[model samples]
Target: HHPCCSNPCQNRGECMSTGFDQYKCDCTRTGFYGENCTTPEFLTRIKLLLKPTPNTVHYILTHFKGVWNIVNNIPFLRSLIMKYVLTSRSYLIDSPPTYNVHYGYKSWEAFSNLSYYTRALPPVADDCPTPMGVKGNKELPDSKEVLEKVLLRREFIPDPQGSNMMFAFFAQHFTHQFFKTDHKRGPGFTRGLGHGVDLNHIYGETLDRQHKLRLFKDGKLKYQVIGGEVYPPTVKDTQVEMIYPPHIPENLQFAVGQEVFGLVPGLMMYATIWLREHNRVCDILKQEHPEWGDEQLFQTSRLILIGETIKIVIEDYVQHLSGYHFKLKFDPELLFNQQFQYQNRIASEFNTLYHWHPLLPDTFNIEDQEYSFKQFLYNNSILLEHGLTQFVESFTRQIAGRVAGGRNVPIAVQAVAKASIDQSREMKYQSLNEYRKRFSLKPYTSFEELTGEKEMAAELKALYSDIDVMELYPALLVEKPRPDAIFGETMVELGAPFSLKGLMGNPICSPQYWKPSTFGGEVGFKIINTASIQSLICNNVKGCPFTSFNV
Candidate 1:
């Protein structure tokens, strides 16, 4: 009856005929036992591929084997929390609050904080001019909404990155002020904060004046804003100028996407983690020390977002997204437009890209227009960059102010400490030359170095592809430079086995004890692989078949 089975296969395999049942595919291999050896996990599958037959089907299957490798390893504590909760489906004794909430100088401090959960950082008060939440997130949810049940979800853990929380906060702020809905009393505060002329706006205006030179040079510029209030301009606007042009470029539009991407997802994740952990802490407080009342608990929770350290929450997310992958694709235009096109695109589509909206992790609304991981990334990258730029700028201004007088100002900017051991220390004693034995760092190199032969762009390409090259940091430090071949063809590839923590923690030079009983120079090390928009065109040209395909 079946023409394909005329030479019936003795080995196990399901029979089928592609050409009107004319012939059958030999399905049996060394280890296969099933009818058609279709079970991929069985040894039969390997044998089927290896069987020296003309069956091209085997070849087609194995070609793309490792393309979709997913990392399913949740952190140990996270796994433990889930395991105990789902199985018994009963409330367990809550965890104690971590007491060491001191986020140091860098935002990455939190992610790099090895002893974090073991020691919860205590909260502090904010100098919000008037109740600005951490990173201007306080006025977001109505103070009442902060404690409301509608805001909390019992079934799912809250987003730890603060993505949804901030979005919700921003949306509420926007609606209340822009829409004039007095649903909450914070609308007045929203308007005042939104309209208030800060140094950023002043600087933005200043950049506007320099736009002609910027456009003439880089052909484009991007300006980015962060936290709470939304500007009236579109994210893609060409009319607005950089915050400081000649210093910043003209073609660049300020990023609305970055803040949304960086702050939102980060804050979302942070909040989710905090909310879940907060409940645990509250439970412990009630059971272990019932004297702590609702006010006490809320106040403690509130301060966590109020102080010098909350900035670490932002930093932690920066470090987390640091290892994120990017594509270079050899597009010379995007080299200048890197932040705008790719990072911006990813940030805008973040919500839909990762399906990271509130209470909808699994049910990704696949058909949503303009929502993809790429957009979310683009938006968030802008947000993070904006924040970092602001933080750096502010810090720089402060330093410049202090140093201008040539007199010391006792400011409480965070400090880092490092120690290294001497190899000759058969018997260790405090050496007077200890500072010489350890590593220390200074600010990013200055203007002339960056613009020097455009080494900065080259360094950027190298760093993106996981190659060591600081000489490139200088390129980014300067305004747009003259176009050259280095800027065009060299692409950075954000490659394999990357995670945010891994990248943010990219090794920076630190003091380490040398057993040298041996001689050496200063005992510091530097982690050269910095995270950035790795232009993909040069490194990934082989994979981008479309260009070659076109050729």
Candidate 2:
């Protein structure tokens, strides 16, 4: 009798006799692995890789970081160090891509509803209890109250790395483009226009909106010179739409993409800079290809801006957050031969995880003048009062608050934090430990390990009782910040998948679209290659010298 006759395999794995007395179990398509086909691949892999001490990515990186840190300071050897860490980080975190479409299979839920979010992990039924809710309505704090008690701070605590205003403002302006809420449909859905960063915040999400923004002459968006400074022109056309309070001055409103961008000064500043950059690049293209018409210049300039967005995000903003001495590069060609699926969709969990509300302080001191959070709201007068150069330079000089710090978010923005927490639960997300395991991180053994403060851990322990039952959003707030990074350990783990994976998956990163021809020639390609946050500010903001996030 052959071993196959004895039915040695499990989980519907097909057993076949390879020899007279031996058999092999094929686990193909079963979502399980191992000799007997009894071990779930997801759980088993997580189990093997998440040991606290030896062999885990955390242990390896932290221990060997000193070598890379020293090498990063050296001029010649720094390139070698970047290669080493990005390789390690990429494989350990995103080898399969965060959403797991690698096996030539995508879920029906994802395929049928193509535009909605894709889950990084299914709800782990075994990990979370039924009706996972408040112990006494008092034992577990309300999501709204948690933001006030756990995240809000009356005083602004400056970041250790001195990340400046531009860093925070860029993140605000850039994310608003894609992470848009579908108010008509509801909070759960996003009207994500495309699977990549297309600068919808600058061009608008619709073709009609984009058309209105375009000048249709020499590839320039509509612009006006005020006080001898350039800006997106004020709305005089009833056909154009951008948001503002009813009481805001009529002439102060500047027409631009994303209704919210017109109201917030920081969001508007980046929008203006990008608007200037697009027209400037178009002018260069016009010089290079004089035969090209307005349509060609505008389209070509749009592609160039998309590339610039990705490059600046990876090289400049991510580098500041990483705090690694090694310079991060935006070399998309490195993924040409990578095995993972290139398809990307923003996850709903991402909306909650990006709760870096603390970056905005209670007050913004500008050019020796102070603006409260209330004044910062719906106020474009500041931009008109001071020129764009002075407006930008002052922000670049201010020190931002510490992210991932307990009680560090401003009281003003607590409502946003509360909404994130509410949405996380409304989705019925799994526990923090379950998310940790899914993201290839070791789950906390105790609340002390998770919070890093005994008193904080005690409160957490009392509320959730067991560490395994901790809520995802609230847990994110209390987790210990990484030594040299801007966010908590789990927050970094959660954010990088959507941030790097989604950004890199941009159609712009594909080889066909990334070539010089796609950008209208080598000059445009070089423009993208040489771009950075510092360079962007200096180029667009008139008379502005070099800028730095470092205070």
Candidate 3:
């Protein structure tokens, strides 16, 4: 009299018991969903709507922006495209705002107390697999083992698109501002200020730390006049302590808005560049309004800097990432007239997706001097030894690892890899296929299909048994690289929404904040409009021969 005892559900769908032999298949965590969970419902539904489209290209047209644009003039296609955007946006944006009270299954409390990190889907406590639980999963290889075997860059794998070490390091420096972890509270909680992308990395996460870094006179950040060149001031005399282990001397530490991200040479170089730019922006404002007070100049320059930062991110970084001939513009007016939430809350999964440690090579060959990854952390002396121009130039010439495949992510930082997997499980993000489903991408039918390497596919099958149970973090690494892109197709598909949403929801993008009056009038607006990562580095670093994020 027990329906579930027969195990009617298929594809790892959990059969749950109910009264009088009534039972249901729990496909919430499974990639498939139906009465018996036999169908890959996500793909099946899309395949139907794509019937009239070309047989060869329906696979392409069904997912991503192709569907968003498929309605060009088609009568039947109109309703589908509208719902597609709404469904993707609603899930990603979590509009109308519901909160998870606690950290696990069915965690609905009050929004007032829901200070946990934002999530696309809350954890399903029961789905966690044992070491080899009949429930399976948590079966993925030890992260260290994976790094040593599949990920260690035994040989340098240069990026196909010619991205250099500077692009990788700059990415690390830039992303740290908004999404850091509160490790003490666990990965389930965010360490970020939960404010907008205010360039808090340089301006300080709190008011006091920010004030400590600013000079009271000229609206400029505090700096050390070393060799008659501008640089972020040294923290040698300050209360700040460098966190990287085997602690380096005080002279190696930088006194900036955020010291944690500034510990490495690449990150330190960018901080120095920004500090120089902030002072220059303050100079422009100072000349424009001679009688204006110091605070006025400082506050106005902040808005200008933050605006410029957003422009560079979308126009330069994202444009390169897109690998499209389409000119990506940072037009605030596109989102200003649209009715949507003015606030941005970044997703938890994005932090896991951004672990681009593989982009770093095993060693740094800068200005003919070499440093291992072990020697690189908290080493500002490297910059002093070579000077800013040589330090910046070295990254442009050096090759970075490809974002795809198993043979990458340096062996030195294996612990970060472990933590990444641990955090994804703790947050109980769904399987790789389920996440793809959430983003409206087709699920991989077998391990071989997604990874594109039969060997990787077989290895994945050995770990999770079926493609449906594959973990999110590692799958992002092993998936076939997206065409003409720096990362995997899966990584780009899942990550782009979070990236675009976070950028568009910035307070500066709204009509009231985007006006010329806010940035000290049109003069400041023009400076931001013209701002590129290249211009920032060239104008700031002396002897900087041509800056680009390529080899």
Candidate 4:
């Protein structure tokens, strides 16, 4: 008889009683089983596990024996089960907690709401509040005002001591020093002869707008569709998404009616200055008032600048790149040759997949179309705006010696700015023209003229008795105006100002659904005729083509 024992079959084979000499074959559960429990049922055990169990087993039997049957039957499957269990528990340790529930498919309206889970987010401002006005609150004089007086562009206002002295001196400089003779900018050329002439190919257009390489049998221009997806303008749901380099304020948000009678060029210049220095979109609201909540960052004032920048960058890139594919195509060769080949610092092998405008510089060979560049600039501007503002807020929240207690921001920034003056001087002295040269633009002689002026010189003499000519430079345009304002309104209004709404066909990028194309298309018959007649001819010839050819 097989006696029931805790160690049923302790040994490998036959069971032996310590006291009784009666022998019985003893085997492991799967190795052997019979009347004496000496038989192997390995296949049976697996099949048994596969068969579902209705009633639960006793605690001891379930824990020790049943568990083995389930695990041993499918060794591979057990690991996956344990892995999932552990992973579910580990989620509690996330950096920023995120939880999602299984919401089943729903109707159109419900589906639209579902997208909110994946929607992009604007940066959140910290709870801490900081004062808006601190040191450096003083406004700088307007640069336009100063330049106007100095250049004698406006009538000189006479002053016995205060205002007149400054105006009279500037008028004298303009008349005698700079404009003594007829000031010709440079030698004239019939066509392209500018120092920084850029030949660009833009994108987006219809087949009709595309340029014709040859005339057809019907005597109409045989249009060629350059490789790109043609989008229909009439489709209401049709949309295009463009990204700016996130840093620039104008790019982040601009206002409506941004263009000056549709004559204003986009923010090609300002984008270079704003985005390259930083890495996020303009958080202008955050910069202006650190005390404001995150929700307030998208205020009207902020949106105005953002909208304008987006409009300018996107529209300019699209128009210049293609002219609705009228004059030129989006040529990869042009981009590679014009932008990268000259500069060893830039990537030689271009990535056609990503293309951006020249203003949005890149470390990689990727190309982002002009629209992409604008978006990139806008993104960077936002980051800098928020960071600097937050930094100021933190400083204010601090007490004495790096503790928590708020202090004035402008004072801190300007006091720190003294060091920047030293830095600028160093940059100037390193190579006056070379150091100053930037963004395919030559440095102006404005600094030299400042040194000659009695007003500026007197201040410099008092500040530094023996200063290098290159070292002493006047403040920037924004600084010259309201020293308090971060940027000049004129910069937004005139210079690089762009309409935010027009970006992607909003109010800034478009006007009455009639956005100005940078391609400079005609309004009517006479307009095209006028443009064709006066436009700088790209055709390589000596005399006028009209004059040479017989009608």
lDDT (10s digit) by residue, model 2, range 1-551: 43443345555465666886677888886667889787888865585566453224444444566776676578556555544444444443332323322111234554556356555543222222242422122234566656655667767777887888878888788888778877676555677656458788888788998898889999889888887777887667525687777787667788887778876888878878888999899999999999999999999999899888888888888877866545677876666655544556666677667767877877877787889988888888887787678877788888887886577878787778787777666565656776776565677888888877887787666666778667777777767776644567888777776787767767788877778999888998999999988889878888856686677
Residue-by-residue lDDT tens digits, candidate 3, 233-254: 7666544433544566666667
TM-score per prediction, in order, is 0.19, 0.84, 0.83, 0.18
With a 3 Å backbone cut-off (N, CA, C), the pairs that clash in candidate 3 are 150-406, 151-408
- After superposition, the stretches of candidate 2 with alpha carbons farther than 4 Å from their true spots are 1-109, 112-114, 123-129, 132-140
Of 2 and 3, the candidate ahead on lDDT is 2
| Candidate 1 RMSD to the real structure | 30.7
Better of 1 and 2 by TM-score: 2
lDDT: worst 10-residue window of model 3: 53-62
Candidate 1 lDDT over residue span 79-174, tens digit each: 443233122211110121112234211245533333232111111212322121112222222312211212122243322322222232222222
Query: What value of lDDT does candidate 1 attain over all alpha carbons?
Result: 0.23
Q: Model 1 — TM-score against the truth?
A: 0.19
Selected candidate, larger TM-score, 1 vs 3: 3
Q: Scored by CA lDDT, what does every candidate get?
A: 0.23, 0.71, 0.70, 0.23
Per-residue lDDT for 308 in model 4? Answer: 29
Q: Which candidate, 1 or 3, has the higher lDDT?
A: 3
214 Cα displacement, candidate 1 (Å): 8.5
lDDT of 1 at 265: 31
Sorted by TM-score (best first), the order is 2, 3, 1, 4
TM-score: which is higher, 1 or 4? Answer: 1
